[PDB]
Structures are given as C-alpha cells and as structure tokens.
C-alpha cells in the first residue's frame, strides 16, 4: 500500500548513469515494477534479529541498519535459505562478501551475474526489456562499517568491524557498495519483480 509505494519510489529514485554505459544491466532511466512481494520467512528473520542484537552491542546500542538493494542470479534461493557467505565469490572488488547497493541500478548490474553475465536466459541480452528481472530490497545490518576507497580482497570484515562500505573514488569506484561477510546480517525483506525500461 504505502509500504510498497516507498519501495517503488526507492527503486525508481535510485537509478544512476553507469560508468559502463549500461553494458552490464541495460539501457534505461526507469523500471516497470510488476510486483513487490514482502518476504515473510520467520527462521531468516530470527537469524537476522539475533545477529542485529549482537552487532548493536558491539557498536554502542546501534545496529547501523540500512535498506539496501541486492542483485544476484540467486534471489529465489536467498528468499528460502537466506543470504549465505559460503556462496560469496572470493575475487570480488571487496572480497568474499554479499554486496548491496543504495542505487537499484548497481544491484541491477548483478541480476544475471558479474557484468550482467551473458544477459537474460532466453534472449541472452544484458539490456533485455522483455524478460522479467528480480531484485531484493534488504534490511542490512552494517554495524561498524569499514570505509575502503580502493579494491581490497578480504575474506571477513576488518578487525572490530561488521561490514565494508566501498565509498566512491575517481580511479576507480563510481558509487557506494555495502559488503557483509555474514549472511545473517541481511534479511531479504522485499522481492521486486521488474523490467528495465527502454528510454
Ligand atoms: O547468499 C548468496 N547466495 C545464495 C544464498 C543462498 C543459497 C544459494 C544457493 C546457491 C547459490 N547462491 C546462494 C549470495 C552470496 C554472494 C553473492 N555475491 C556474489 O557472488 C558477488 C557477485 C554477484 C553479486 C555481487 C557480485 C557479489 C555478491 O553479493 C550473491 C549471492
Ligand atoms: N550484487 C549487488 O547487488 C551489488 C551491489 C553493490 C555492489 C556490487 N558489486 C554488487
Ligand atoms: Zn530476455
């Protein structure tokens, strides 16, 4: 209702002009949101709130919770089994983590894989406007977030930290990206079924 409209507003307002020229996610300025489904998985929520509490206690009664986008070819697995760092790619910009973004267009670059992979399954198009894509709008506990400006391949959060904020840099990092090294620090709150729209 008002809950889904703010999700739809956040999905549209956070689109950016990508330094890849739309190569990975596609050519678009806006989406066509088809459905917003609220994921209600109590076992995943219990895991999330438990870790959230531990984190708050190690960061001045502050979880540093953010509402962030996640784009991955594994969204249906995530909605059932939750985020899992055991599946995290080791050679990512910030290492073996679960990457999230404030800009839905960044998460959109990863729905079919790193640099959009091949593209959509049935047409093999990264800029496909026909096939329906899926993004997750997640509750993310960042806790004590470590600000890293360059590439740093780490396996776990830096000592005393609960995440990594990959802040924007000239040579080279276009937009912010939030990385957790523990799956229990994010809850797949909303499942956005959408299509990127041709300008
Ligand atoms: O929890 C995740 N997967 C799964 C969760 C439950 C079950 C699963 C079963 C099978 C496979 N996966 C599963 C998950 C972890 C890490 C990443 N991940 C990456 O592999 C890299 C590239 C892709 C997005 C950006 C760049 C980054 C990232 O966030 C995506 C998803
Ligand atoms: N997979 C994603 O949604 C994502 C978010 C931020 C940064 C990166 N690299 C990926
Ligand atoms: Zn397609």
Look at the alpha carbons of 145, 3, 197, 71 in this order and tell me if their dihedral is positive or negative.
Answer: positive
> What does each C-alpha distance from 122 to 112, 130, 138 come to in angstroms?
12, 10, 28
**Contact status, residue 43 vs residue 78, Cβ threshold 8 Å:** no
Residue of minimum CA distance from atom 9 in ligand 1: 77
Which tokens go with 74?
């594994």
Number of neighbours of residue 54 by Cβ within 10 angstroms: 15
Tokens standing for 25?
């996610």
Resolution in angstroms comes to 2.6
For residue 191, the cross-strand partners are 37, 136
What's the length of the chain? 199
Ligand nearest to the CA of 125: 3
Task: Name the method of structure determination.
Answer: X-ray
User: Per the structure block, which two tokens stand in for 71?
Assistant: 């784009």
The rounded distance, in Å, linking the Cα atoms of 42 and 95 is: 29
Instruction: With beta carbons less than 8 A apart as the criterion, state whether 154 and 164 touch.
Output: yes
Residue given tokens 């999230």 in the structure block: 100
Mind giving me the DSSP string for 88-150?
A: --TTSTTBSSEEEBSSHHHHHTTSSSGGGTT-STTT--TT-SSSPEEEEEEEEE--SEEEE-S
What is the C-alpha to C-alpha distance for residues 24 and 35, in angstroms, rounded to an integer? Answer: 23
Task: Establish whether 131 is an annotated binding residue.
Answer: yes
CATH topology assigned to domain 1-199: Phosphoenolpyruvate Carboxykinase; domain 3 (3.90.228)
Contacts of 57 (CB under 8 A, 6+ apart): none
Calculate the dihedral angle through the C-alpha atoms of 183, 139, 147, 164, rounding to the nearest 10 degrees.
10
Among protein residues, the one whose CA lies closest to atom 8 of ligand 2: 99
Residue 81 C-alpha to ligand 3 middle, in angstroms? 27
- Say whether 123 counts as a known binding-site residue: yes
Contact assessment for residue 131 and residue 121, using Cβ atoms and an 8 Å cutoff: yes
Do the Cβ atoms of 12 and 31 come closer than 8 Å?
yes
Q: How far is the CA of 98 from the centre of ligand 2 (A)?
A: 8
- Residue 93 has φ and ψ, to the nearest 5°, of -50, -45
The pair of structure tokens assigned to 61 is 């009664």
Q: Is 94 in the pocket of ligand 2 (CB under 6 A)?
A: no
Mutation choice for ligand 2 from 77, 107, 166, 188, CB with most ligand atoms inside 8 A: 107
Query: What is the CA angle 25-91-17, rounded to 5?
Result: 25
- With 0-12 / 13-18 / 19 or more C-beta atoms within 10 angstroms meaning exposed / middle / buried, residue 94 is buried
For residue 69, what are the β-bridge partners? 101, 137
Q: Which residues line ligand 1 (CB under 6 A)?
A: 72, 74, 77-78, 81, 83-84, 87-89, 92, 98-99, 110, 114, 183
- Does any ligand 2 atom lie closer than 6 A to the CB of residue 116? no
Distance, CA of 148 to CA of 135 (rounded, Å): 25
Distances (CA, A) of 10 to 28, 180, 191, 192: 16, 21, 13, 11
Angle (nearest 5°) at CA 9 between 29 and 197: 25
DSSP 87: G
> Measured from the CB, is residue 103 less than 6 Å from ligand 2?
no
């Amino acid at each position: 209702d008002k809950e889904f409209q703010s999700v739809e507003e956040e999905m549209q307002s956070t689109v950016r002009e990508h330094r890849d020229g739309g190569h990975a996610g596609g050519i678009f300025n806006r989406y066509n949101i088809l459905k917003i489904q609220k994921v209600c998985n109590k076992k995943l929520w219990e895991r999330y709130t438990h870790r959230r509490k531990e984190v708050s206690e190690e960061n001045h009664n502050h979880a540093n919770e953010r509402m962030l986008f996640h784009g991955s070819p594994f969204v249906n697995a995530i909605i059932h089994k939750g985020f899992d760092e055991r599946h995290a790619y080791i050679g990512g910009m910030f290492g073996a983590g679960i990457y999230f973004a404030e800009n839905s267009s960044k998460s959109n670059q990863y729905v079919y894989g790193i640099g959009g992979g091949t593209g959509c399954p049935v047409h093999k198009d990264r800029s496909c406007y026909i096939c329906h894509r899926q993004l997750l709008f997640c509750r993310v506990t960042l806790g004590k977030s470590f600000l890293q400006f360059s590439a740093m391949k780490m396996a776990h959060s830096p000592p005393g930290h609960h995440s990594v904020t990959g802040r924007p840099s000239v040579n080279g990092l276009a937009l912010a990206e939030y990385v957790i090294y523990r799956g229990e620090q994010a809850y797949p709150e909303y499942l956005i079924t959408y299509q990127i729209m041709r300008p």
